[PDB]
């Protein structure tokens, strides 16, 4: 697969509800432990995802 | 199933000067290199039939490279798999860890996950081509993957069936949309005619719900196959003949259309009942003639393709010897 | 990389094959726009404030043919 | 039965712009100038020079050691293989009305 | 609000370059001229 060349023609602004946040987000923060070892703690706010 | 689809995409051209020398050939080559053998827009691309439309080889404004881009709309052959499709050849790469899964060995690549919940699934062994039916869940065509992903179980003909009620008489000028499909089934039946009748009989009696060794063969010029049981001594009608009756424009479409488990699935015959003479496992579905006829035609096409693929892939008696244990699973499950 | 179907930023990686859109899932149509990391950060900041930004990619144009 | 409202995602209500059709104005009906503007000549030369850097095949008989000179002499000698598209209008019906101009048959401005 | 991308500020804030000056007019390749004068690399 390849991503063809494209340009932005317009921008639409809207109020983002919780549904948009749930759909767009790639993970859910559950713990307050920032770091586990050198690598970021999984489920924290620095999760590599 | 195999179908014609139209996509439209944008192709980046690294050397526009060389690309434009033979635009059609270069565009076809690029489309084949990029899209053939990958899942795109909920469809698996098999080959590129042609380029319906295209645009001039523009030059990228935003970047300072001389590279160009071309909007191309192309018609290709794609494979879409619905629910309940039957896949004759499925090799089990790894039946272990209470999870099962196998890869299709047909023109439409698929990765099917078989649950360990069912005992029949656990019985199957690795390196064994086991026929499989996809579950009711839709097939997941992740873009960019070279094979579709689905969940299925070893095909065990189920006794429960459904009855369809037609409230609208035959749709007029939609008989042509149905004829598009009768053509596909005709091609499938012509293909089935070539192979030997004995292997077809073997597989039909293996997958016939009510196994019959009587060797009695219902003979229809398009279709020949061993006969089954008779319910209420009722007379089924060939779907192809009723569709041909479109010239008459009268087809008695209202009557309940149903195919009992006894009635061979590959056979075009289906029973028409004025009332709910067929036992209704579920309340007869209130559907139009379009929905029903398309449904019955799809089911028969699925079963005919299943049978042709079964005959082709098990063309060796020794492979059948290995898979007789799978056959025993099906036979043990079969009741009558 | 922006998904044409939904106009939202998407996930595309060529070396490691990734062609994914969180919103559309299947039916994703990724297109590569040229931009600046500053503009990306600006859009991410605006989204953080619960202002959804949808980018309408320029339409494809074909010869009459 | 009172009905509550749950706001759908914005993406669901978004419909992408439909594909357009390129409407090329006939040669005799063009109304834009037949003399390349300085911007258009500069863009043509720059694009041709970049493509020469990509692919070195050139029609010019004389030999030069720089892509810029090759592109300049191609424009001046009317051998440049590029075309100029002037987008006039984008109608709501889904048409892109444009004018296609051939640099080799156009007037060239004073670039020096 | 729906904001079309025109002028200088709007493309600039979106990371793109304004479509004016040298980028006002599109440049497309002359397929007819090339197919009669140039030869494919493979050919
Ligand atoms: Zn999307």
* The two three-digit tokens of residue B8, written as one number: 């439209």
Interatomic CA distance for residues B307 and B197, integer angstroms: 11
Measured between alpha carbons, how far is residue E9 from residues C1, E6, E12 in Å? Answer: 22, 8, 5
Closest of D53, D22, A10 to residue B54, by C-alpha: D22
C-alpha distance from E36 to closest chain C C-alpha (Å) = 21
Q: Are E22 and D42 in contact (CB under 8 A)?
A: yes
Interface test mutation site (partner E, options C39, C40, C42, max chain E beta carbons within 10 A): C39
A14 chain-E contacts, CB cut-off 8 A? none
E41 chain-D contacts, CB cut-off 8 A? 55
* The two three-digit tokens of residue B57, written as one number: 């080889």
Q: Do C62 and D18 touch (CB under 8 A)?
A: no
Q: Are D104 and D76 in contact (CB under 8 A)?
A: no
B40 bridge partner residues? B43
Sequence-separated (6 or more) residues with CB below 8 Å from residue A10: C55, C56, E2, E3, E4, E5
B65 chain-E contacts, CB cut-off 8 A? none
Distance of CA B56 to the CA centre of its chain: 39
SS3 category, B6? strand
Measured between alpha carbons, how far is residue B245 from residues B249, D5, D94 in Å? Answer: 6, 51, 44
* The two three-digit tokens of residue B186, written as one number: 């005709």
Q: Do B69 and A1 touch (CB under 8 A)?
A: no
Closest of C26, A35, B31, B33 to residue A44, by C-alpha: A35
Distance B56 CA to ligand 1 centre (A): 27
Interatomic CA distance for residues B194 and B273, integer angstroms: 34
The answer, for B220 touching chain A at a CB cutoff of 8 Å, is no
Q: Closest residue of B to A7, CA-based?
A: B62
Q: Are B289 and B253 in contact (CB under 8 A)?
A: yes
Closest of C30, C25, C26, C27 to residue C10, by C-alpha: C30
Interatomic CA distance for residues A24 and A7, integer angstroms: 22
Determined by cryo-EM
Residues across chain D: 112
- Can you give the C-alpha Rg of chain E in angstroms? 18
CA atoms lying within 13 Å on the CB side of residue C13:
5
Q: Do A10 and E16 touch (CB under 8 A)?
A: no
What angle do the packed helices D67-77 and D38-54 form, to 10 degrees? 130
Closest of B240, B242, B116 to residue B182, by C-alpha: B240
- Site of tokens 């980018």: C55
Bridging pattern class, strands B58-59 and B68-79: antiparallel
Q: Do C62 and B54 touch (CB under 8 A)?
A: yes
| Candidate from E23, E27, E40 with C-beta closest to B21 | E40
Interatomic CA distance for residues B225 and B207, integer angstroms: 13
Burial of B267-295, coded b for 16+ CB within 10 Å and e otherwise, reads bbbbbbbeeeebeeeeebeebbbbebbbe
SS3 category, B170? coil
Q: Do C28 and B143 touch (CB under 8 A)?
A: yes
Q: CB B209: neighbour CB atoms within 10 A?
A: 21
D16 chain-C contacts, CB cut-off 8 A? 4-5, 7, 29, 56-57, 59
Sequence-separated (6 or more) residues with CB below 8 Å from residue B324: none
Distance of CA B130 to the CA centre of its chain: 17
Interatomic CA distance for residues D9 and B104, integer angstroms: 37
C-alpha distance from B66 to closest chain E C-alpha (Å) = 11
Interatomic CA distance for residues B159 and B150, integer angstroms: 24
Q: Among the residues of chain B, which ranges form H helices?
A: 16-19, 23-35, 119-123, 175-194, 197-207, 239-244, 289-313, 317-333
C8 chain-D contacts, CB cut-off 8 A? 11
What angle do the packed helices B289-313 and B175-194 form, to 10 degrees? 20
Dihedral sign computed on CA atoms, order B97, B101, B102, B103: negative
């Amino acid at each position: 697969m390849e991503a063809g060349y494209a340009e932005i023609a317009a921008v639409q602004f809207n109020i983002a509800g919780d549904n948009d946040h749930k759909r767009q987000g790639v993970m859910e923060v559950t713990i307050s432990n920032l770091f586990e070892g050198t690598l970021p703690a999984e489920g924290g706010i620095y999760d590599a995802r | 199933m195999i179908d014609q689809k139209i996509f439209e995409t944008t192709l980046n051209i690294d050397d526009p000067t060389n690309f434009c020398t033979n635009v059609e050939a270069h565009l076809l080559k690029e489309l084949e290199n990029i899209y053939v053998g990958k899942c795109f827009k909920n469809s698996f691309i098999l080959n590129i039939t042609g380029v319906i439309q295209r645009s001039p080889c523009f030059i990228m404004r935003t970047n300072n490279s001389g590279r160009g881009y071309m909007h191309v709309r192309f018609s290709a052959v794609v494979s879409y798999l619905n629910a309940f499709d039957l896949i004759a050849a499925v090799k089990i790469i790894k039946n272990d860890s209470n999870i099962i899964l196998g890869e299709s060995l047909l023109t439409e690549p698929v990765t099917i996950v078989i649950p360990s919940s069912e005992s029949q699934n656990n019985v199957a062994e690795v390196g064994q081509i086991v026929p499989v039916q996809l579950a009711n869940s839709s097939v997941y065509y992740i873009p960019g993957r070279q094979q579709a992903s689905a969940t299925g179980s070893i095909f065990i003909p189920k006794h429960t069936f459904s009855v369809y009620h037609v409230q609208e008489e035959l749709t007029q000028e939609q008989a042509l949309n149905l004829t598009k499909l009768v053509n596909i089934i005709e091609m499938l039946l012509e293909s089935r005619s070539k192979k030997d009748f004995k292997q077809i009989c073997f597989f039909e009696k293996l997958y016939y719900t009510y196994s019959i060794s009587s060797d009695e063969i219902l003979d229809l010029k398009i279709w020949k196959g061993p006969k089954g049981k008779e319910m209420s001594r009722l007379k089924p009608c060939n779907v192809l003949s009723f569709l041909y009756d479109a010239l008459k424009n009268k087809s008695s479409s209202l009557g309940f259309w149903a195919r009992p488990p006894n009635l061979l699935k590959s056979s075009p015959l289906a029973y028409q009942q004025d009332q709910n003479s067929f036992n209704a496992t579920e309340l007869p579905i209130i559907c139009s003639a379009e929905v029903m006829f398309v449904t019955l035609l799809k089911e028969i096409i699925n079963y005919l393709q299943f049978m042709n693929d079964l005959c082709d892939t098990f063309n060796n008696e020794q492979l059948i010897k290995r898979h007789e244990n799978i056959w025993m699973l099906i036979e043990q499950r079969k009741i009558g | 990389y922006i998904c044409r179907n939904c106009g939202e930023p998407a996930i595309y990686n060529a070396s490691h094959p990734i062609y994914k859109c969180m919103n559309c899932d299947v039916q994703a149509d990724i297109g590569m726009v040229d931009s600046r990391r500053s503009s990306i950060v600006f859009q991410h900041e605006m989204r953080a404030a619960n202002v959804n930004i949808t980018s309408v990619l320029s339409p494809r144009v074909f010869q009459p043919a | 039965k009172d009905e509550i409202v749950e706001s759908p995602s914005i993406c669901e209500g978004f419909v992408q712009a439909s594909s357009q059709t390129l409407v090329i104005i006939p040669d005799n009906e063009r109304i834009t100038s037949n003399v390349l503007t300085t911007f258009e000549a500069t863009r043509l030369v720059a694009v041709r020079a970049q493509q020469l850097a990509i692919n070195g095949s050139t029609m010019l008989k004389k030999k030069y050691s720089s892509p810029i000179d090759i592109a300049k002499q191609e424009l001046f000698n009317r051998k440049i293989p590029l075309l100029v598209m002037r987008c006039i209008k984008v109608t709501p019906e889904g048409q892109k009305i444009v004018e296609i101009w051939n640099p080799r048959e156009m007037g060239i401005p004073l670039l020096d | 609000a729906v904001n079309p991308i025109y002028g200088i500020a709007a493309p600039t804030l979106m990371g793109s370059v304004p479509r004016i000056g040298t980028m006002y007019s599109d440049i497309i390749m002359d397929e007819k001229y090339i197919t009669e004068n140039y030869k494919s690399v493979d050919s």
